[PDB]
Design a protein around this motif. Structure first.
Motif, PDB file in Angstrom:
ATOM      1  N   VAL A  78      -5.132   2.250  -7.015  1.00 53.12           N
ATOM      2  CA  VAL A  78      -4.058   3.087  -7.549  1.00 53.12           C
ATOM      3  C   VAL A  78      -4.558   3.909  -8.729  1.00 53.12           C
ATOM      4  O   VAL A  78      -4.255   5.099  -8.849  1.00 53.12           O
ATOM      5  CB  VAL A  78      -2.840   2.230  -7.934  1.00 53.12           C
ATOM      6  CG1 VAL A  78      -1.912   3.003  -8.848  1.00 53.12           C
ATOM      7  CG2 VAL A  78      -2.096   1.793  -6.700  1.00 53.12           C
ATOM      8  N   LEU A 138       4.943   5.854 -12.446  1.00 45.32           N
ATOM      9  CA  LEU A 138       6.320   5.837 -11.986  1.00 45.32           C
ATOM     10  C   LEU A 138       6.442   4.989 -10.727  1.00 45.32           C
ATOM     11  O   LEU A 138       5.682   5.190  -9.775  1.00 45.32           O
ATOM     12  CB  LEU A 138       6.798   7.255 -11.709  1.00 45.32           C
ATOM     13  CG  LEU A 138       8.286   7.425 -11.426  1.00 45.32           C
ATOM     14  CD1 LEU A 138       9.102   7.140 -12.666  1.00 45.32           C
ATOM     15  CD2 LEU A 138       8.571   8.808 -10.909  1.00 45.32           C
ATOM     16  N   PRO A 139       7.364   4.035 -10.683  1.00 42.85           N
ATOM     17  CA  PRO A 139       7.580   3.268  -9.456  1.00 42.85           C
ATOM     18  C   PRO A 139       8.453   4.020  -8.463  1.00 42.85           C
ATOM     19  O   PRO A 139       9.220   4.917  -8.809  1.00 42.85           O
ATOM     20  CB  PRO A 139       8.281   2.003  -9.956  1.00 42.85           C
ATOM     21  CG  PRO A 139       8.968   2.426 -11.183  1.00 42.85           C
ATOM     22  CD  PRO A 139       8.138   3.497 -11.811  1.00 42.85           C
ATOM     23  N   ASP A 140       8.314   3.629  -7.202  1.00 44.56           N
ATOM     24  CA  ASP A 140       9.080   4.238  -6.125  1.00 44.56           C
ATOM     25  C   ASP A 140      10.542   3.818  -6.209  1.00 44.56           C
ATOM     26  O   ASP A 140      10.858   2.669  -6.518  1.00 44.56           O
ATOM     27  CB  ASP A 140       8.484   3.837  -4.780  1.00 44.56           C
ATOM     28  CG  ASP A 140       8.800   4.822  -3.688  1.00 44.56           C
ATOM     29  OD1 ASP A 140       9.389   5.878  -3.993  1.00 44.56           O
ATOM     30  OD2 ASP A 140       8.455   4.543  -2.522  1.00 44.56           O
TER      31      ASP A 140
ATOM     32  N   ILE B 762       4.510  -4.001  -6.605  1.00 45.20           N
ATOM     33  CA  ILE B 762       5.444  -2.890  -6.713  1.00 45.20           C
ATOM     34  C   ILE B 762       4.862  -1.688  -5.987  1.00 45.20           C
ATOM     35  O   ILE B 762       3.641  -1.498  -5.916  1.00 45.20           O
ATOM     36  CB  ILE B 762       5.768  -2.570  -8.189  1.00 45.20           C
ATOM     37  CG1 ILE B 762       7.076  -1.789  -8.294  1.00 45.20           C
ATOM     38  CG2 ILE B 762       4.649  -1.789  -8.837  1.00 45.20           C
ATOM     39  CD1 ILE B 762       7.607  -1.682  -9.689  1.00 45.20           C
ATOM     40  N   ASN B 763       5.759  -0.885  -5.417  1.00 42.14           N
ATOM     41  CA  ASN B 763       5.416   0.378  -4.778  1.00 42.14           C
ATOM     42  C   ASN B 763       5.449   1.493  -5.813  1.00 42.14           C
ATOM     43  O   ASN B 763       6.409   1.608  -6.576  1.00 42.14           O
ATOM     44  CB  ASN B 763       6.395   0.696  -3.646  1.00 42.14           C
ATOM     45  CG  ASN B 763       6.341  -0.309  -2.519  1.00 42.14           C
ATOM     46  OD1 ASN B 763       5.304  -0.903  -2.255  1.00 42.14           O
ATOM     47  ND2 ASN B 763       7.468  -0.498  -1.842  1.00 42.14           N
ATOM     48  N   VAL B 764       4.413   2.313  -5.832  1.00 41.33           N
ATOM     49  CA  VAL B 764       4.307   3.412  -6.782  1.00 41.33           C
ATOM     50  C   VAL B 764       4.788   4.692  -6.118  1.00 41.33           C
ATOM     51  O   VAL B 764       4.616   4.887  -4.910  1.00 41.33           O
ATOM     52  CB  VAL B 764       2.867   3.557  -7.312  1.00 41.33           C
ATOM     53  CG1 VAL B 764       2.439   2.286  -8.017  1.00 41.33           C
ATOM     54  CG2 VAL B 764       1.909   3.879  -6.196  1.00 41.33           C
ATOM     55  N   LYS B 780       2.656   0.807   1.661  1.00 40.05           N
ATOM     56  CA  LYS B 780       2.713   1.909   0.724  1.00 40.05           C
ATOM     57  C   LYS B 780       1.862   1.605  -0.506  1.00 40.05           C
ATOM     58  O   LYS B 780       1.667   0.442  -0.861  1.00 40.05           O
ATOM     59  CB  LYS B 780       4.151   2.181   0.310  1.00 40.05           C
ATOM     60  CG  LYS B 780       4.992   2.774   1.404  1.00 40.05           C
ATOM     61  CD  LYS B 780       6.194   3.493   0.832  1.00 40.05           C
ATOM     62  CE  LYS B 780       7.262   2.522   0.400  1.00 40.05           C
ATOM     63  NZ  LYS B 780       8.061   2.071   1.561  1.00 40.05           N
ATOM     64  N   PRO B 781       1.328   2.633  -1.163  1.00 39.61           N
ATOM     65  CA  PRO B 781       0.509   2.393  -2.354  1.00 39.61           C
ATOM     66  C   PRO B 781       1.288   1.659  -3.435  1.00 39.61           C
ATOM     67  O   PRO B 781       2.464   1.929  -3.678  1.00 39.61           O
ATOM     68  CB  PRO B 781       0.117   3.805  -2.800  1.00 39.61           C
ATOM     69  CG  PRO B 781       0.176   4.602  -1.563  1.00 39.61           C
ATOM     70  CD  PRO B 781       1.314   4.051  -0.773  1.00 39.61           C
ATOM     71  N   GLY B 782       0.618   0.712  -4.071  1.00 40.84           N
ATOM     72  CA  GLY B 782       1.250  -0.090  -5.097  1.00 40.84           C
ATOM     73  C   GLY B 782       0.252  -1.069  -5.657  1.00 40.84           C
ATOM     74  O   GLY B 782      -0.922  -1.073  -5.287  1.00 40.84           O
TER      75      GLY B 782
END
Ligand SMILES: CCCCCCCC/C=C\CCCCCCCC(=O)O[C@H](COC(=O)CCCCCCCCCCCCCCC)COP(=O)(O)OCCN
Ligand SMILES: CCCCCCCC/C=C\CCCCCCCC(=O)O[C@H](COC(=O)CCCCCCCCCCCCCCC)COP(=O)(O)OCCN
Ligand SMILES: CCCCCCCC/C=C\CCCCCCCC(=O)O[C@H](COC(=O)CCCCCCCCCCCCCCC)COP(=O)(O)OCCN
Ligand SMILES: CCCCCCCC/C=C\CCCCCCCC(=O)O[C@H](COC(=O)CCCCCCCCCCCCCCC)COP(=O)(O)OCCN
Ligand SMILES: CCCCCCCC/C=C\CCCCCCCC(=O)O[C@H](COC(=O)CCCCCCCCCCCCCCC)COP(=O)(O)OCCN
Ligand SMILES: CCCCCCCC/C=C\CCCCCCCC(=O)O[C@H](COC(=O)CCCCCCCCCCCCCCC)COP(=O)(O)OCCN
Ligand SMILES: CCCCCCCC/C=C\CCCCCCCC(=O)O[C@H](COC(=O)CCCCCCCCCCCCCCC)COP(=O)(O)OCCN
Ligand SMILES: CCCCCCCC/C=C\CCCCCCCC(=O)O[C@H](COC(=O)CCCCCCCCCCCCCCC)COP(=O)(O)OCCN
Ligand SMILES: CC(C)CCC[C@@H](C)[C@H]1CC[C@H]2[C@@H]3CC=C4C[C@@H](O)CC[C@]4(C)[C@H]3CC[C@]12C
Ligand SMILES: CC(C)CCC[C@@H](C)[C@H]1CC[C@H]2[C@@H]3CC=C4C[C@@H](O)CC[C@]4(C)[C@H]3CC[C@]12C
Ligand SMILES: *[C@@H]1O[C@H](CO)[C@@H](O)[C@H](O)[C@H]1NC(C)=O
Ligand SMILES: *[C@@H]1O[C@H](CO)[C@@H](O)[C@H](O)[C@H]1NC(C)=O
Ligand SMILES: *[C@@H]1O[C@H](CO)[C@@H](O)[C@H](O)[C@H]1NC(C)=O
Lengths: 173, 1277
Positions: A78, A138-140, B762-764, B780-782
């Motif tokens: 990330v 920022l989180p989704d 967590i998903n970013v 999903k990226p996280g």
């Protein structure tokens, strides 16, 4: 008196000289003094002195280490895709963030006290360091509206994050 | 006799409301959540189907089978159809998720029957239809103007931009295989060219995401692909919706100047001016309503209760009660909040006010109590709060009663109470508008509900609460495109155009009519009553023949001399330059130059280029301080310090000058090398950032702007107090019901605070808009983070300060939807009411009060506030005729067949309509981007060559048929010649060179011709004049807004220059340089999440690394600084100073846009008089002798006709007026036009008392002399 990365449970079975492969700040001496995977939970350091049980606990330590490594690779994946990594802070760079995040994660997997540390720091404080040196990510927002929350946060509503009975591990910054 | 009773009609109306309720519960999801309701609603349907059927047969049996009866019968039909459809649904035959429920779409319309009685007015229906026709024609014109601007910016967006398909991805992304895990975080656009846009960093490559298999359906609907996508994008941006992030994409994909020019001019023209023209139209509708309404015609306990000490004690008790209730802040997860000391205080105060009410009743009797209409509200509060204190309705909706007691505090200030009565007016104008708004919202929600309740995977219209939230959200404009996008994706591809038309039409009506009506109602409440205006003034066929009939039926010593000389030095064919050069003394000109140079220098100061360590930035500082020391010494020696009438300290301007001088002097003497954050040195730098405010004092036009703005500060302050009272009510309620209840685990799979520990993945957020749903077997990226029980970080209601901050942020409607969703999801759905009510009371009404008071004070400053609407229309006509000139059409030649026939050709309306259609068609030629490697651009450029040759022959015809001399007379003809010459230049280049700059030039010529289209339409030209002349009139207001923005930009570079990147502070929006700060502050008032930016700039440890020495090494934000800075900037600019632009647009609309009224000289009358004068004035002098006047008057036909069959007296009066005006000679086209204007209106209505007495004296003199000359002609014979 130098370090000795652990590779085989059988080969290593003076424990303050054998460090884990990924979480390379924890010796076996410290892990046997506090950490115990519940399945094979008999290792209160009375399994090394008095050895299949030892193999069971050291392989558990290695599995903890491997899972921590996978999680850290996800994090640095990330952080690699974060393009503003060189702009987000005049004080912090991705390497500082990486080091403190690895320390936080390794403390999450091995919640023990570290001995023979030049500088010491409450282990929970590494959480705060990730909040400080790492970028705001920022989180989704599909399942829950986070508001303005960051992905990595440490303290909740009305909580004193630092308390008594802390592992108080090494300081590597 | 069975249907005309009083109770039966009330029954039918209540049953119409009940039918609306019945159909609002008839959704598949509602019946899944409450199965009983199904049969319930059926029963209701049946019952109503009975009763209304009665009122049809019991009525159409009386009269043989009012245009309401056909509507009521269609309603009965809809009810029967819904009944049989629901019978089929009950029997499981119909799916109930099928579109058959769409047959219930008309049923909500029955609500009209519940209000049809309120459709009787004091004006006859003829006047009402005249008002509505005038407003409809004006709305049509303004919509054409809006569409013109939308097409202009759509073509500009197609040609200046393209598709945003180039993204930064990991280099090892193979074509066809991109995934969520190949993009950057967050997803970012780039340019494949080394000089434009964003360059991907090492490890990333800029790929096309179209050769890679992505579809333009999983990439958004916005952008500038073709003209349709672009027009929709431009319309979305004009609502200040989603244009900032579109602009970020454009800046990353293309050169920067393109995006800055494009989006800033789009916001300035479309989002401000063209939008304000609709508000002007509605304000004119209310002015026309006014014009129509005008031209239509115990022995001692009572004494201690009457004392003012008792009133002071009771209002102090109300104050203490509401303060104590608001101060019940969240203290942690180990307290009760149920029977604590706050509850006992509430019990005590409830008992106290119940005793006060009992005592007032026991003194004044009951009926004399309840008649007060304020004792009714107090009794309502007594009952509601007594029920509230029962310890099961404590901290529930009943708390609304408790927090409402602050309303009683309005009786501490008689002035605030008078202002409330003034600005809210009668409960029949504003209250009727609120009821209409609620009814329209309910009906549109019910209709959209019946349209979309069955659509699969659309959770926006599953139930009536959700459909109402969706329609309310579109009304507030926050994320309305998201609502429409979700619906469009859900409905499919075939019906998406129809639902898009539906949603766009609803948004257009809502935002351009409803909100404008709110503004116009507030302004009408602030405007004095017409009869009161006339009374206050007193305390201080052809229209010509109609007005003639009306008029008839009505009958010590030294070194001060040198200083005074130096500070007063100052200083015709071209007098404009000479008035610009003598605007201020030479000393003030030098000081303006030095101020501007110092600001230009400060624009280079950043955290890493500081004025304390860079001498090139200290040059201007030393210069400013030295020259201001000289200026102050000179002005103080000459004009004295305090005492003299023109002393230096006589107003706030001189005080601010001394303040700025002292700040800069102390800074330059100190020049601190280390400036800690939140110190006194940084405060000194922030104060030094106030230097541009000297322009407000040195330039008299800026002084005028500021003076006029602050002339209305009392009303601005009273509106501020009302909004603060509303926010206090809702903040106390939010603290009492929400404190500690907005926190939850950041892991969505955890529910209890006891399970919220450990770590989770967590998903970013990668891309908010992009929809690469394709995921084969990857996640999903996280990454892994601790579980935390946390508040949303942008708002909470844990104490009254946080609640007031959250409500102030909601007041701006930015991000309010996230607050709404958090409150509904974490506290409960019943608490949606709360947020919605606030948003209706604070935004639709609260901020509209600011709009209204600012426009009212503007109109009062310009002097038109006490004039009646007829007098204001007379002033506007007199201004319109002061600029009208004789027509620019030379006569048709005689027996020049090559020119006479060509004259009839070019001046024929078919020819002009054809030319306008050709302008529009060549404009259409720019629908796809004119590239140089695209095939279609060659057909488009060839057709453009055909078009410009057509326009060439048109211009040659108009030059030879008319004249080479007369063709240059029209400015439009000169513009057309310029554009046609540019066109032929482009043609010869395009066939010679054929480069990409050739296509750029061709597109530019097409755009300039499209802009020419505006001179070929009356209403378009009037509206374009309105816009450009109001932009000219708002030059100094825009300069003042820019000066304030520049002060704030300097201060923000000082305060937030190195703030850590956050939610919205990033490489696109930050304060790292003054230019970035300026762009950010511009976006903060025109459609960016300013409150997100504020909360990013409030960052404190442990979310940043503080530094104890300097602020440029600290990475942190200022908490109090960010609060004050962002809140004050948003209030000053967005709520106060843009309403000045609204006021100017309204003024210039009433000035330039003219409708053909009945009792005033119109635009067609001006054109007809111009034609007649062109035929009477032969050689085009613009000045005729005296006998040509009687010839012209005999010639006038139409509405200016003076026929010698009934109005010979009028003819003689006008001819003698034109004789007398200059002792018998050379009237000048404005003498005759002024005479016509005066003889064409009822001067008793249109003129003011001075002008009225002058004109009546003039006309009496004229009539007396005409009677004298008639008597002399008689005595001659
Ligand atoms: C923002 C405000 C928008 C809220 C709209 C609520 C609303 O419309 O209710 C209206 C109520 O308006 C009000 O807000 C009155 C309550 C004001 C409370 C004042 C609190 C006192 C605070 C002390 C201020 C110190 C004074 C200093 C001034 C020098 C009702 O209209 P009406 O009074 O019946 O007049 C119409 C006559 N038929
Ligand atoms: C939510 C509720 C809000 C109401 C709070 C406002 C307080 C006052 C209520 C407004 C009010 O009563 O105005 C009265 C009612 O307001 C109206 O006129 C209703 C507006 C028409 C709504 C049409 C609904 C169909 C629209 C969908 C298509 C005005 O009537 P009047 O002039 O007083 O009496 C005329 C008889 N000769
Ligand atoms: C969309 C609407 C679709 C259908 C609307 C139903 C209208 C019912 C027509 C009945 C009608 O013609 O009423 C006639 C006049 O009609 C009216 O004035 C309607 C009353 C005004 C209600 C105001 C509602 C307007 C709301 C605006 C809607 C904006 C939403 C648009 C969003 C996409 C009565 O005239 P009359 O027959 O000469 O009466 C005396 C005879 N003895
Ligand atoms: C897309 C955004 C639109 C941009 C804003 C709309 C542009 C409007 C188009 C053209 C502007 C035309 C200016 C109107 C001239 C008004 C005539 C007037 O009353 O001023 C006449 C003289 O003209 C002036 O006042 C000149 C103004 C004095 C100097 C201006 C000082 C402002 C400095 C600008 C800020 C500088 C920034 C600092 C450095 C970064 C008065 O004559 P008088 O007889 O002595 O009394
Ligand atoms: C609400 C937020 C509004 C934001 C507007 C901010 C503007 C920048 C601050 C203005 C400082 C410039 C002062 C200019 C000035 O002194 O205006 C003079 C007074 O204006 C004022 O009242 C401003 C005082 C409060 C400003 C804060 C006008 O008087 P005059 O035209 O010179 O007539 C002379 C004989 N009576
Ligand atoms: C009506 C306003 C009455 C003020 C209520 C003061 C209660 C209070 O102490 O609020 C404290 C914080 O709230 C404030 O700062 C009050 C600010 C009032 C601004 C609105 C006027 C709660 O303590 P904490 O959560 O531990 O930090
Ligand atoms: C860019 C916008 C160009 C404006 C084209 C349409 C303007 C039509 C208009 O607003 O009224 C017209 C305004 O006339 C103009 O000033 C057009 C501007 C051209 C200025 C001189 C032409 C050469 C330089 C361009 C009225 O025309 P007229 O009464 O025949 O003299
Ligand atoms: C619409 C026109 C009139 C509306 C008035 C707008 C301003 C009122 C709205 C909101 C003000 C809210 C008051 C902020 C208090 C924050 C609550 C709080 O507990 O924070 C506490 C505040 O602590 C502080 O040091 C902040 C003290 C600075 C007070 C700043 C208040 C002034 C705001 C300026 C707004 C001016 C509006 C425009 C007027 C021209 C501490 O919390 P923490 O997280 O531990 O640090
Ligand atoms: C018209 C109706 C709703 C009025 C109801 C008033 C009653 C229910 C209220 C008013 C005063 C209240 C009491 C005030 C005192 C106490 C003692 C305290 O230790 C617990 C709450 C308790 C026991 C309250 C119970 C509820 C109470 C009795
Ligand atoms: C005509 C007069 C009044 C205007 C010019 C004033 C002169 C004296 C001002 C203008 C620019 C100023 C210089 C600007 C820059 C620096 C670098 C700083 O590190 C030391 C002071 C110094 C060297 C200033 C000395 C004074 C200075 C030369
Ligand atoms: C897509 O990428 C994955 C990951 O490397 C790879 O395993 C797969 O074969 C690729 N498929 C194509 C069609 O490129
Ligand atoms: C992608 O970029 C990285 C860093 O430059 C490089 O090490 C890697 O080999 C590249 N992979 C490619 C070009 O496929
Ligand atoms: C992240 O997204 C996945 C979908 O791949 C979803 O299943 C999961 O619940 C999400 N996790 C969080 C914490 O939102």
């Amino acid at each position: 008196g130098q370090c000795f990365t652990v590779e085989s449970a059988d080969a290593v079975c003076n424990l303050s000289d054998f460090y884990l492969s990924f979480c390379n700040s924890y010796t076996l001496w410290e892990l046997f003094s506090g950490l115990s995977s519940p399945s094979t939970l008999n290792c209160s350091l009375d399994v090394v002195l008095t050895m299949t049980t030892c193999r069971q606990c050291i392989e558990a330590y290695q599995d903890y280490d491997h899972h921590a490594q996978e999680k850290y690779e996800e994090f640095e994946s990330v952080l690699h895709k974060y393009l503003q990594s060189d702009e987000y802070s005049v004080k912090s760079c991705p390497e500082d963030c990486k080091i403190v995040y690895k320390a936080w994660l390794c403390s999450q997997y091995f919640e023990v006290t570290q001995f023979n540390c030049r500088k010491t720091i409450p282990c929970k404080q590494y959480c705060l360091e990730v909040q400080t040196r790492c970028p705001f990510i920022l989180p989704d927002n599909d399942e829950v509206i986070y508001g303005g929350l960051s992905s990595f946060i440490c303290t909740g509503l009305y909580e004193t994050f630092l308390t008594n009975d802390e592992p108080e591990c090494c300081d590597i910054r | 006799l069975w249907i005309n009773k009083p109770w039966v009609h009330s029954l039918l109306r209540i049953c119409a409301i009940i039918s609306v309720i019945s159909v609002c519960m008839n959704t598949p999801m509602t019946f899944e959540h409450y199965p009983p309701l199904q049969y319930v609603t059926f029963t209701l349907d049946t019952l109503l189907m009975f009763l209304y059927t009665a009122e049809m047969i019991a009525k159409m049996h009386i009269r043989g089978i009012d245009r309401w009866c056909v509507f009521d019968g269609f309603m009965v039909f809809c009810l029967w159809v819904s009944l049989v459809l629901q019978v089929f649904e009950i029997a499981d035959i119909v799916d109930q998720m099928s579109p058959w429920g769409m047959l219930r779409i008309p049923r909500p319309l029955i609500m009209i029957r519940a209000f049809r009685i309120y459709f009787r007015f004091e004006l006859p229906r003829t006047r009402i239809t005249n008002i509505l026709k005038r407003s409809g024609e004006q709305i049509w014109s303004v919509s054409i103007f809006l569409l013109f601007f939308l097409l202009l910016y759509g073509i500009l967006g197609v040609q200046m931009f393209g598709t945003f398909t180039y993204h930064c991805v990991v280099n090892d992304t193979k074509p066809g295989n991109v995934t969520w895990n190949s993009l950057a975080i967050p997803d970012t656009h780039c340019s494949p060219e080394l000089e434009e846009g964003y360059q991907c960093p090492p490890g990333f490559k800029c790929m096309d995401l179209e050769d890679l298999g992505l579809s333009r359906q999983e990439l958004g609907y916005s952008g500038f692909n073709e003209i349709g996508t672009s027009i929709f994008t431009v319309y979305e941006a004009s609502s200040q919706e989603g244009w900032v992030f579109l602009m970020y994409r454009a800046i990353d994909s293309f050169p920067r100047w393109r995006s800055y020019f494009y989006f800033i001019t789009l916001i300035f023209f479309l989002a401000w001016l063209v939008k304000n023209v609709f508000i002007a139209v509605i304000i004119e509708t209310f002015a026309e309503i006014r014009v129509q309404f005008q031209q239509m015609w115990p022995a001692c306990l009572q004494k201690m209760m009457r004392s003012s000490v008792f009133h002071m004690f009771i209002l102090s008790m109300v104050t203490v009660d509401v303060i104590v209730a608001a101060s019940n802040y969240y203290k942690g997860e180990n307290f009760r909040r149920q029977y604590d000391e706050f509850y006992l205080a509430e019990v005590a105060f409830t008992v106290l006010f119940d005793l006060e009410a009992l005592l007032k009743i026991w003194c004044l009797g009951f009926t004399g109590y309840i008649s007060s209409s304020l004792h009714k509200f107090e009794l309502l509060l007594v009952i509601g709060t007594t029920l509230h204190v029962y310890p099961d309705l404590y901290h529930s909706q009943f708390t609304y009663f408790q927090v409402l007691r602050v309303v009683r505090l309005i009786k501490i200030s008689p002035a605030l109470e008078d202002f409330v009565y003034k600005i809210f007016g009668p409960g029949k104008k504003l209250g009727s508008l609120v009821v209409f708004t609620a009814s329209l919202l309910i009906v549109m929600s019910a209709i959209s509900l019946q349209m979309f309740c069955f659509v699969e995977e659309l959770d926006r219209f599953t139930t009536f609460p959700r459909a109402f939230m969706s329609m309310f959200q579109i009304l507030t404009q926050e994320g309305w495109v998201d609502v429409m996008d979700q619906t469009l994706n859900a409905v499919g591809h075939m019906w998406a155009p129809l639902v898009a038309i539906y949603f766009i039409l609803y948004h257009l009506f809502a935002t351009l009519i409803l909100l404008s009506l709110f503004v116009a109602v507030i302004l009408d409440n602030l405007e004095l009553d017409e009869d009161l205006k006339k009374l206050k003034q007193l305390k201080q066929r052809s229209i010509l023949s109609v007005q003639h009939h009306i008029r008839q039926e009505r009958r010590e010593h030294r070194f001060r001399n040198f200083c005074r000389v130096v500070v007063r030095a100052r200083f015709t064919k071209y007098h404009q330059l000479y008035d610009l050069l003598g605007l201020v003394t030479y000393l003030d000109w030098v000081m303006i130059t030095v101020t501007i140079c110092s600001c230009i220098s400060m624009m280079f100061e950043s955290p890493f280029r500081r004025v304390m360590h860079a001498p090139t930035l200290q040059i201007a500082e030393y210069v400013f301080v030295i020259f201001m020391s000289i200026e102050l010494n000179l002005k103080i020696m000459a004009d004295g310090l305090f005492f003299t009438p023109t002393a230096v300290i006589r107003d706030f301007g001189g005080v601010m000058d001394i303040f700025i001088y002292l700040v800069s002097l102390i800074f330059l003497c100190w020049m601190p090398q280390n400036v800690p954050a939140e110190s006194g040195a940084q405060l000194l730098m922030v104060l030094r950032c106030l230097r541009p405010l000297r322009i407000f004092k040195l330039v008299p036009q800026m002084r005028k702007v500021v003076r006029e703005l602050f002339s209305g500060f009392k009303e601005i302050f009273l509106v501020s107090i009302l909004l603060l009272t509303l926010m206090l009510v809702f903040a106390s309620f939010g603290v009492q019901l929400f404190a500690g209840k907005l926190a939850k685990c950041n892991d969505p799979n955890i529910i209890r605070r006891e399970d919220c520990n450990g770590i989770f993945r967590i998903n970013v957020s990668v891309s908010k808009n992009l929809n690469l749903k394709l995921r084969p077997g990857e996640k999903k990226p996280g990454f892994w983070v601790p579980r935390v029980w946390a508040n949303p970080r942008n708002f909470n209601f844990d104490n009254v300060g946080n609640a007031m901050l959250a409500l102030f942020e909601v007041l701006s409607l930015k991000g309010w939807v996230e607050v709404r969703d958090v409150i509904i999801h974490r506290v409960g759905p019943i608490h949606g009411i709360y947020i919605h009510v606030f948003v209706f009371l604070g935004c639709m009404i609260g901020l509209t009060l600011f709009v209204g008071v600012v426009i009212a004070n503007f109109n009062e400053n310009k002097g038109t506030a006490l004039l009646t609407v007829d007098q204001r229309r007379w002033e506007d006509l007199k201004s319109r005729l002061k600029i009208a000139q004789p027509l620019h059409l030379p006569p048709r030649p005689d027996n020049d067949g090559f020119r006479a026939k060509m004259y009839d050709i070019t001046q024929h309306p078919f020819f002009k309509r054809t030319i306008a259609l050709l302008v529009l068609a060549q404009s259409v030629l720019l629908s796809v981007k004119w590239d140089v490697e695209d095939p279609v651009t060659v057909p488009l450029a060839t057709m453009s060559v055909v078009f410009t040759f057509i326009f060439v022959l048109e211009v040659t015809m108009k030059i030879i048929a008319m004249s080479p001399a007369g063709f240059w007379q029209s400015r439009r003809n000169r513009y057309d010649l310029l554009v046609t010459s540019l066109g032929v230049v482009w043609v010869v280049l395009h066939f010679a060179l054929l480069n990409a700059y050739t296509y750029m030039m061709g597109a530019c010529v097409i755009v300039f011709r499209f802009f020419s289209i505006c001179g070929k339409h009356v209403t378009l030209k009037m509206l374009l004049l309105t816009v450009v002349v109001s932009m000219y009139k708002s030059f100094f207001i825009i300069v003042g807004m820019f000066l304030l923005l520049l002060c704030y930009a300097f201060a923000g570079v000082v305060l937030f220059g190195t703030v850590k990147y956050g939610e919205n502070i990033n490489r696109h929006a930050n304060f790292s340089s003054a230019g970035k700060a300026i762009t950010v502050l511009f976006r903060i008032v025109t459609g960016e999440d300013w409150n997100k930016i504020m909360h990013d700039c409030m960052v404190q440890p442990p979310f940043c690394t503080p530094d104890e020495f300097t602020y440029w090494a600290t990475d942190c934000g200022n908490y109090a600084g960010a609060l004050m800075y962002f809140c004050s900037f948003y209030v000053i600019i967005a709520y106060i100073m843009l309403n000045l632009l609204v006021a100017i647009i309204v003024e210039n609309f009433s000035l330039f846009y003219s409708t053909e009224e009945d009792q005033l000289l119109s635009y067609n009358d001006l054109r007809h008089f111009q034609i007649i004068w062109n035929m009477v004035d032969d050689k085009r002098e613009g000045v005729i002798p005296t006998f040509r006047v009687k010839f012209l008057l005999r010639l006038l036909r139409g509405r200016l006709e003076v026929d010698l069959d009934k109005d010979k007296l009028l003819f003689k009066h006008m001819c003698y007026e034109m004789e007398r005006l200059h002792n018998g000679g050379d009237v000048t086209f404005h003498d005759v036009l002024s005479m016509l204007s005066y003889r064409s209106v009822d001067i008793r209505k249109s003129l003011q008392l001075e002008e009225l007495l002058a004109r009546e004296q003039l006309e009496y003199t004229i009539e007396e002399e005409v009677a004298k000359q008639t008597i002399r002609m008689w005595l001659k014979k």
